[PDB]
């Protein structure tokens, strides 16, 4: 039968099948009833070339098929025919067999006694464990962005210190240039008074250059330490992401045992 077939999911949306053939291998296939919501009209989608390629299953006189010449009796016959041999018969442009089926009620990884608490209790547990680990991820991403812009604020400030220091060092190298042969001329006149005026000013220059050099390393030191904890926030987010996805899918499929009741009473209670 078609309704019980592995690869028939029913009222599933295109965006939902795109989320199920993501990064899968060529040949993975799945069929829905067409998005048109018209009875007895279906669409098959298979992975080929990194793309999800859709094809329409026409229906006429009870027969089936996806071309103007229509043949098969049921879709299960149409599909299994192309599970045994390739569909290059239809179009040589793609020549993969319907290799990997993705079924609706496999991956149902609830193993213990199916007491209704497997929903009312273990679902609320995983969902509580999912929203907590989501709270932490958003907290990390916030201080991650804060730390990100604080770092570049400091990188441009040390770059400013570099220019100021470049400009005070060239000042020293011009003081020695234009004061040398006046110091040398004062020296033989016996005018130590004027020499100490020059040296008193040269000391003043390289005295301040020491202060801005110290202010730079004190900033490079804060930068080095904040750049480090920025990398730690990164690896923590990378460790929380795979876990967060793992228990989000577990919370999602634990609605399977809610679908056991169908009507969403056992979650409306929560």
Partner 1 sequence: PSSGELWGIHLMPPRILVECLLPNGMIVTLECLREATLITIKHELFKEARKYPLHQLLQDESSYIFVSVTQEAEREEFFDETRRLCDLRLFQPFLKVIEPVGNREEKILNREIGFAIGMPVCEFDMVKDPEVQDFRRNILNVCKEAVDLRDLNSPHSRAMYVYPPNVESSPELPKHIYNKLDKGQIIVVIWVIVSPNNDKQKYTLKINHDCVPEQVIAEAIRKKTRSMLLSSEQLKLCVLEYQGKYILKVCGCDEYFLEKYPLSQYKYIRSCIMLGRMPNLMLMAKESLYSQLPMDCFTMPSYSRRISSTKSLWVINSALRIKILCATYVNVNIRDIDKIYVRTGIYHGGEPLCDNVNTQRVPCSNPRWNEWLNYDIYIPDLPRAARLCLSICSVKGRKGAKEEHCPLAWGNINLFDYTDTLVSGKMALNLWPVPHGLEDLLNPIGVTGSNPNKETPCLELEFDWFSSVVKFPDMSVIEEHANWSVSLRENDKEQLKAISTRDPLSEITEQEKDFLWSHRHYCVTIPEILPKLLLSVKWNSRDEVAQMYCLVKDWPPIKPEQAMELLDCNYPDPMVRGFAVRCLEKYLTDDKLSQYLIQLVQVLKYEQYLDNLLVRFLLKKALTNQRIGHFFFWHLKSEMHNKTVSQRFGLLLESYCRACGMYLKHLNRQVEAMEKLINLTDILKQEKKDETQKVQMKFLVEQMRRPDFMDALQGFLSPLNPAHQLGNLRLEECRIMSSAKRPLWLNWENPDIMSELLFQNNEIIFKNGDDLRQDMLTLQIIRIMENIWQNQGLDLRMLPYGCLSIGDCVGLIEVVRNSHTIMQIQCKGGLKGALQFNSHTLHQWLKDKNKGEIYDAAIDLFTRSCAGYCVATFILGIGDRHNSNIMVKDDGQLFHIDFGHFLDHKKVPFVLTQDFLIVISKGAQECTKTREFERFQEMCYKAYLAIRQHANLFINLFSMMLGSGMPELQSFDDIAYIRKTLALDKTEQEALEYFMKQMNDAHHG
**Nearest-angstrom CA–CA distance, 77 and 63:** 10
Could you write out the DSSP letters of every residue in 43-81? EEEEEETTEEEEEEEEEETTEEESSSS--BSSHHHHHHH
14: left (phi over 0), alpha (psi -120 to 50) or beta: alpha
CA distances from residue 17 to 13, 46, 128, 147 in whole angstroms, order as listed: 7, 10, 27, 38
Could you write out the DSSP letters of every residue in 170-198? HHHHHHHHHHHHHHHHHHHHT-HHHHHHH
Nearest distance from C-beta of residue 14 to partner 1, angstroms: 6
Token pair of 47 as six digits: 């992975």
Nearest distance from C-beta of residue 185 to partner 1, angstroms: 11
- Residues with Cβ < 8 Å from 90, sequence gap 6 or more? 66, 67
Nearest distance from C-beta of residue 50 to partner 1, angstroms: 4
Nearest distance from C-beta of residue 151 to partner 1, angstroms: 9
Nearer to partner 1, 21 or 266 (CB): 21
Which candidate, 89, 83, 13, places its Cα nearest to that of 54? 13
Nearer to partner 1, 1 or 207 (CB): 207
Nearer to partner 1, 1 or 149 (CB): 149
Nearer to partner 1, 7 or 266 (CB): 7
Contact status, residue 161 vs residue 215, Cβ threshold 8 Å: yes
Nearest distance from C-beta of residue 237 to partner 1, angstroms: 9
Beta bridge partners of 43: 32, 56
Residues that bind partner 1 (CB under 8 A): 13-15, 18, 22-23, 26, 35-37, 43, 49-51, 53-56, 66-67, 91, 93-94, 109, 141, 152, 155-157, 159-164, 167-168, 171-172, 174-179, 182, 194, 197-198, 201-202, 204-205, 208, 212, 227, 231-232, 234-236, 238-239, 241-243, 245-246, 249-250
Place of tokens 């209704």: 116
Nearer to partner 1, 36 or 269 (CB): 36
Nearer to partner 1, 202 or 255 (CB): 202
Nearest distance from C-beta of residue 242 to partner 1, angstroms: 4
């Amino acid at each position: 039968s078609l309704q019980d077939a592995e690869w028939y999911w029913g009222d599933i949306s295109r965006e939902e099948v795109n989320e199920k053939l993501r990064d899968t291998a060529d040949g993975t296939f799945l069929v829905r009833d067409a998005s048109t919501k018209m009875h007895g009209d279906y669409t098959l989608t298979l992975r080929k070339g990194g793309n999800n390629k859709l094809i329409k299953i026409f229906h006429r006189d009870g027969k089936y098929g996806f071309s103007d010449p229509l043949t098969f009796s049921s879709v299960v016959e149409l599909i299994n025919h192309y599970r045994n041999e390739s569909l290059a018969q239809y179009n040589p442009k793609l020549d993969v067999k319907l290799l990997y089926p993705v079924s609706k009620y496999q991956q149902d990884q609830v193993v213990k006694e199916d007491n209704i608490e497997a929903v009312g209790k273990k679902l609320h547990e995983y969902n509580t464990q999912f929203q907590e680990k989501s709270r932490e991820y958003d907290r990390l991403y916030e201080e991650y962005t804060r730390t990100s812009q604080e770092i570049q604020m400091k990188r441009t400030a040390i770059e400013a210190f570099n220019e100021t220091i470049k400009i005070f060092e060239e000042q020293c190298q011009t003081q020695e240039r234009y004061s040398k042969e006046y110091i040398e001329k004062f020296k033989r006149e016996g005018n130590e008074k004027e020499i100490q005026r020059i040296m008193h000013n040269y000391d003043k220059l390289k005295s301040r250059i020491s202060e801005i050099i110290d202010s730079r390393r004190r900033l490079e030191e804060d930068l080095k330490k904040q750049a480090a904890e920025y990398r730690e926030i990164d690896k923590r987010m990378n460790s929380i992401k795979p876990d967060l996805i793992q228990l989000r899918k577990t919370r999602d499929q634990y609605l399977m045992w809610l679908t056991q009741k169908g009507v969403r009473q056992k979650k409306l209670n929560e």
